[PDB]
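Hey Z.,

So I finally got round to the 4QM thing we talked about over coffee. Here's the setup:
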Amino acid sequence: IQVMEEAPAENTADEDAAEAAAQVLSSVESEIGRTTDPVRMYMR
Amino acid sequence: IETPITANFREGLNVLQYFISTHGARKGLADTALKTANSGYLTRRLVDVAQDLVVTEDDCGTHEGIMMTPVIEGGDVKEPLRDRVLGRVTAEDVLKPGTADILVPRNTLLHEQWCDLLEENSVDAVKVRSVVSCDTDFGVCAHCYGRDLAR
Amino acid sequence: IGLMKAVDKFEYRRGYKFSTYATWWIRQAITRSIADQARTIRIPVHMIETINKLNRISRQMLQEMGREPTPEELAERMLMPEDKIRKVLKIAKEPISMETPIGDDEDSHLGDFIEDTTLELPLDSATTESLRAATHDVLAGLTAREAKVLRMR
Amino acid sequence: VYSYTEKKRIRKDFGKRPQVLDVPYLLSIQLDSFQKFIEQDPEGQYGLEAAFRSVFPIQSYSGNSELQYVSYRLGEPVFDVQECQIRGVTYSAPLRVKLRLVIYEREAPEGTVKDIKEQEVYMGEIPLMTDNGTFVINGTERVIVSQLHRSPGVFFDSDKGKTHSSGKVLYNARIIPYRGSWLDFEFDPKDNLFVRIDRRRKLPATIILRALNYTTEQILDLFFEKVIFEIKLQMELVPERLRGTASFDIEANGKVYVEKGRRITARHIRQLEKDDVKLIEVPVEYIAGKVVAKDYIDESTGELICAANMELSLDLLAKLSQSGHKRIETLFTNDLDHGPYISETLRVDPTNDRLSALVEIYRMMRPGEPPTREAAESLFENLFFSEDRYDLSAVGRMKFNRSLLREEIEGSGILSKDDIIDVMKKLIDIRNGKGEVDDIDHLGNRRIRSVGEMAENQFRVGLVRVERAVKERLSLGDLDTLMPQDMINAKPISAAVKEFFGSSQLSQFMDQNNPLSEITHKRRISALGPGGLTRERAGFEVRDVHPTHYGRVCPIETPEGPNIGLINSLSVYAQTNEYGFLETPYRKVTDGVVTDEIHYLSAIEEGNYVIAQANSNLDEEGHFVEDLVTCRSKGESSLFSRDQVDYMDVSTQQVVSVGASLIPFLEHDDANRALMGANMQRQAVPTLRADKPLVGTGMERAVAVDSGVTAVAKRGGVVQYVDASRIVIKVNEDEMYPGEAGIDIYNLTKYTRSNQNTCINQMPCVSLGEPVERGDVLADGPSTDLGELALGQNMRVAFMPWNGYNFEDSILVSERVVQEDRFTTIHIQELACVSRDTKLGPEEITADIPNVGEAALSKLDESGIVYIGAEVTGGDILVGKVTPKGETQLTPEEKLLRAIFGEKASDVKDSSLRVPNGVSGTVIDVQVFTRDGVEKDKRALEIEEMQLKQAKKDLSEELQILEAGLFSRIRAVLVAGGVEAEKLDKLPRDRWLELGLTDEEKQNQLEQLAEQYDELKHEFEKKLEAKRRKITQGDDLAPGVLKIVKVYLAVKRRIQPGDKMAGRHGNKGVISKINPIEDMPYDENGTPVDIVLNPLGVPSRMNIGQILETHLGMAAKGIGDKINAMLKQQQEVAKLREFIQRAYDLGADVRQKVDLSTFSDEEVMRLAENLRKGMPIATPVFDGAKEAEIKELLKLGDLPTSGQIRLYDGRTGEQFERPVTVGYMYMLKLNHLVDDKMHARSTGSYSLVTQQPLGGKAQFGGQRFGEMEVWALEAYGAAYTLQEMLTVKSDDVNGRTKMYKNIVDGNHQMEPGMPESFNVLLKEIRSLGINIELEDE
Amino acid sequence: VPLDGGRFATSDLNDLYRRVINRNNRLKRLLDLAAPDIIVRNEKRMLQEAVDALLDNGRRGRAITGSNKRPLKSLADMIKGKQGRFRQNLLGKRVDYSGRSVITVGPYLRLHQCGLPKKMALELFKPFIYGKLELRGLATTIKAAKKMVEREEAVVWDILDEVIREHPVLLNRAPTLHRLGIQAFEPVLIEGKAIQLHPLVCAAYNADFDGDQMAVHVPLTLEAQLEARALMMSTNNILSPANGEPIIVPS
Ligand SMILES: CCC[C@@H](C)[C@H]1CC[C@H]2[C@@H]3[C@H](O)C[C@@H]4C[C@H](O)CC[C@]4(C)[C@H]3C[C@H](O)[C@]12C
Ligand SMILES: CCC[C@@H](C)[C@H]1CC[C@H]2[C@@H]3[C@H](O)C[C@@H]4C[C@H](O)CC[C@]4(C)[C@H]3C[C@H](O)[C@]12C
Ligand SMILES: CCC[C@@H](C)[C@H]1CC[C@H]2[C@@H]3[C@H](O)C[C@@H]4C[C@H](O)CC[C@]4(C)[C@H]3C[C@H](O)[C@]12C
Ligand SMILES: [Mg+2]
Ligand SMILES: [Zn+2]
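And the result:
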């Protein structure tokens, strides 16, 4: 996908990558306090 | 813009007409660059796809091919048969328009003399051997390609 | 780790506030580290102390001189033989990144312009083989025993 | 009346339109800005005063102590500009600020203070700007270009039916502060307003209103109007409200007003208003869909019957009626115009109270932290509304108030509830069709920031950092005997300034090809830089040319490449307002008369007038001649009646820049070629002798003088002394300043190196006793001739093919052009030799070098440095140096060889400086810098002695010439009031100051005071002498270097095939051949042609200004050849006065009028000797010479009016058919020399990690062979060529030495091997966890 | 690598390796002190982060920066990218025996010949000149030959004219858009510093004479010379490979 802070070059993504990204994307919503930061984990 | 520039360069453009012309100039200058960058993308992608295709055989021995006829868009003909058929190899015998006998037997590279003969007989449908329908494995044969076009 | 060191060496009988028999053991351990593993080219704790002292004595001299001090005035203000100051003022700062962008033409990095100085030039490798031959000629043009004498010597 | 320098050579001027406004100083954008920065403003609003007042005073915890700012000053720079350049150090002044620490004691905080400590602290050095708009940073001259950025304020924009499949237009609104956060108000496709705080997640707009202590009632009162209802069931009717499709038509007075079904029209409203309708009865169902306005409660039990903003139904109406409620309120909302966008936002509002809103904002900004009432209130109150963290500058308030249609320009720099509500109302009105969005390309929405502003914004940053540090320091202790000197360290403050001036995108090396490049570099506007755009995200919207550029930004001159349209040039008359907006002058027109008073209008202020064109014929009294005159209204142009115009363009040049206004016949060139021509004219290289243009536009003198390459007279006078190096002017008595000596000295800049390694040389253009006035040029700089810019040479050119030697754009040149040195240039380069101290011992500079056989040691002196004046060539030694090497380990045959011949090891290297191969010049300068501890070898002492002698001689010559002027003036004063004439000269010179005057006693005390003042001046000059003998001080050489020796070589480059030449019309080419003179085409008189150009290049490239320039140059040179003849046949002035007056009077209603009847005879003959090589001609940009005038001028000389003569072939003598076009064209030598572009490599040095040929010419690198060339070789069958290009020629380490040995053996065969780009790849993959290995055959 | 003035330049991998080693040593030391499990868990997390930054920096974390604010370059960053080895170096490297210059017309030339500056050729063909000098007895050894060519003796020009006699050179113009952007020519030694290009070849290169430059390479092996003469020579390539029409038409 194109972040493009502004509104708008070909597709080369394997479906396997696609399906896996979809599943992890679903998990993000179901997540509660996922933290990928050591200092933050340490404080907690 | 509805009003044109009614002056030419032998005369002079006044300041307003020159100010109008500046837009077109800068637009063209900015375009050219985009065109260059976009033609490079296509070429890189097309050599990535087709880099390892090589002529690896002399004659696969197939009997199939495309059917070349002149291309006509409604009115006149914009590409005759000679341009489309020159330099290729026939897949089937080109029967004389009277259906009498074979004009070019088969597997004949159609050089200029043969094309002149075809124009003489006014035939407008020739079946030629094509790369896309070659029986060779991992490569292409010389007869399904045609001729070099540079040699 | 300094905190662990404190807890094991703390005596409550003297009634010291820990939060004080530790706030030291902790700072000693942070500074010892910042000195022993903060630079790619390790410097002794003594040299680091000296460099920090000079960088300070220098700030004060600049504020009261409206001008950077001179290796001579630094030596005078400090207690150093002047040449020692220049040696400590040479301890190169941290190595530069070899990927530092130096571009605007081809996107080339700084490490691309650093040459190899331990390489033999090809006219010196051809010259060497030419001598290794010529020697065979002038020597062969001699009798066996003397030629072998020269070869062995 | 003509100027002295301009009466020596008057340029004939076409150009029928008169001049009302003279061209301005072309460097006032740079010089005004920095004066406003470094300068003292009482009402501190500009420069450093503003920053100090904005940061100081600094307050610590509990206000126990305060640090007040009093003033500031700048000290004198230690080194002047020339010493800064020679010594390689920044030219700057030290900033010293007097602060005051005040301490508050206990008891009453706001009362007596313990003590006040006042102290001056030195806080960094600020670079100073030269008198030409440049800075010296590290000995190099820099230019800091201006920046065009978007102005702070409120801007309403939309999506123009984009990013929406439906095609709906979503409108937005953004507040942009000078420094702060970006508020916003955008529309969701469901028509709901959502404010985005800092590019964060959007939330409904109403949240913010609730965060501003607003209730729902107040929100509705502000946004919606009110519809009242009474309870039978009567409603008050307003005729205007029911404009119109109604459920119930009307029921007023019972009888009739209008039937049902029919929509209400205008006439119905007219009848209702005429009948005074105020109360009506309507069915209950009509209110079935409305919304109650305010909260309605029941008095029986004090229960809430219905809250505000709730749909009203029949049951609620019945309950209210039976509960005693008669007055029921609702809200208006016609979907067509006054639609409802706030109501939905409230209904979808996740907030009911301010605290919840603050908590939500807290989570959005910094999610995950425990929200707290005090913390959230503080965060919101600090985000905006805080002077420290949010500034809406004076320009921002003006562009905000004006956008919302307020009457106050002045205001507060912080937001408020009123401002936000008004922004919301304006956006809603836009969404309702009232109003329009803004164009973000309009030069009324773009601002210019120049060096003073950018520099003060970086000083304020440093001041903020230091203020934070000081606050921290005073947060603890607050002890006494703490002066304000230990708290302030200068490095943090100076870091920002040094980094900005040194390494920044807008601070760049000045262009010193010629005067034009400097001038055009200084007045340049860039859209890049910090706070601006970037190349990747620019898009073509901002690269276009807008209608508002007219007269402000040049549409022609812009680079062609990655950033075209992002960098522009300031137009000739364009100037900046008090707020940073380009504005341009217009000549005011009263009812009918075109007055002569100019108003400077801005881009937006100009939209609502009708401005006539400069080429608009006017009568002798100012009235427009034609009934209808073409003018440009708001956006477009069209004819207007003469009686409804109010402004007129001030000139025909005011649209173009200075570079594009130097092209004659610009109207006849295609725009692409004009762009190319301006860009190339910026690149011309000055030549040994300068040549004025024969065909110019009149802008040459302005560019030459407003650049500083020339010496211009400050005050008038008579030239007392002239020399190749200085000029001494004896000023007129009218401008003496009685305290002065009366003479001024100009020191010319002799051969000196520019940033492009060209030569900077000034030579005088006056003579002894020659009367000068103020503004007259005294010495021409590079590329100037008698005060006029002169970038090239006048070449005799013929347009014809000639044998394929001008095939594409190639140029054929004569050998007479190369013999006469017309395009020979001087290039100065400097080389350095540094002697460092290695680990094995210091390096030495010596004349004794190992393995050098006295062949290349002749030019060196006894100290090891070349003599000054030596003619060196490639490979010669300039400075002889040796480096200590240790050990060797001789091979087994190198030991035997050393034995037989008994030759021992040198033990030192030969790391000496030598001339780069291919260069050949003379050494014109050598300078040596040594550390403090080093011995200052003999040559260094010689140079120091020479410097001391030169400084003493110059200072003493200054003092004695000034004394001579002083004594002469005193003698002149002594002619009256006790005059001695014969006896005055008898007494010695020293007894002038003791000469008496009228008798008195107070006069004697003044005499003694004057003697004391004179002795003090003597001591002053003596101490100056002492100071100068003191720059014998050691140098601040970088660490590890003992000394540096710099040598300056002056090469003289001639013209040769491969050099690039150009005209002023975008016609460039490469010289292809230098042709003998007997082989060039010639005319019937035997004169050959200098240059032969190809005609086929003109038709396709529609730049036919070069043909007209050639014809007019032929005419001008014809006039010049008829004067050479009369001056060589020694004819009388009467005859030269008649002809030279017939050529200065030719034309069709031209504005110029030269009267050669007021000229002396000595002045008619000095003009005729300056016009004997061609009469100069001026053809303004869009007011040029008509072709008929060119024909007439050709006829004044004896040349054919066709412009074409008949030529003969020099090789055969046969005349060409169909005569050819010959004339004179102005050619430039562009700075693309084939000397600097030819490079060949066989073998050289290699890179360390990727052992590949190095890259470049200095490194003597190789050629890059990339993918598209690999594809080309694969398209052939060239597999061996590819293999040897990939391995043996690039990075096959042991396969490249074997190839060399094989080549020198006559055996052309390779053993390729494996590239080292693959071995490194294997090691890098293997140093991950992967195991990649080469499989056995 | 040491630089001038005592400065040192280092690769970013040294920083990452030092990080990994420091955290590993600290973890080993901390395991022997029987520290509370919070400390050892945090140390193990740090070690994991350091190793992941070494192998692939900023793939899951945010990043790691050095003295500057730029992210450190990791092992994965040295293979991938548009600058990585698997790209840049391996098909787009610098080459020996090459040089560029400006092009002029030279209308007197034949289609198989190009004008080459004598000075550019005395450098490109240097080893050939040394070999042919030593083979004719002009120079006793190779150092002698190096000084003879350095002094530019008279015999050196004759030897150069002999070396260049039949030895093609490849000429290439910037955007190689098709295979006619590299072609082989026989050199003709000329004065000056600009290459002369036969007019009829310009259309193939899309080249004009207003400042354009060309690169020249010299084939070394016998096979490379034969390929230049038989495959790439300009007189063998007069038809366009796109269409059989001639590409050498007068312009
Ligand atoms: C702006 C483009 C980047 C590049 C041109 C700039 C950025 C940082 C600069 C280097 C560093 O300062 C460290 C050293 C300082 C010494 O004094 C001279 C060498 C040294 C390597 C510098 C040369 C050059 O100037 C550098 C590489
Ligand atoms: C356009 C960017 C400028 C770039 C080409 C300039 C700017 C600084 C220069 C380097 C520094 O001097 C540090 C090293 C000094 C050694 O002696 C030679 C290599 C070294 C990298 C220099 C080569 C080159 O000259 C550099 C990279
Ligand atoms: C009344 C007019 C005075 C004027 C003619 C006299 C007064 C002082 C004289 C100059 C100074 O002596 C300094 C230099 C001395 C050198 O020897 C020759 C040049 C030099 C500039 C002199 C030229 C001339 O002689 C000057 C200007
Ligand atoms: Mg070109
Ligand atoms: Zn086939």
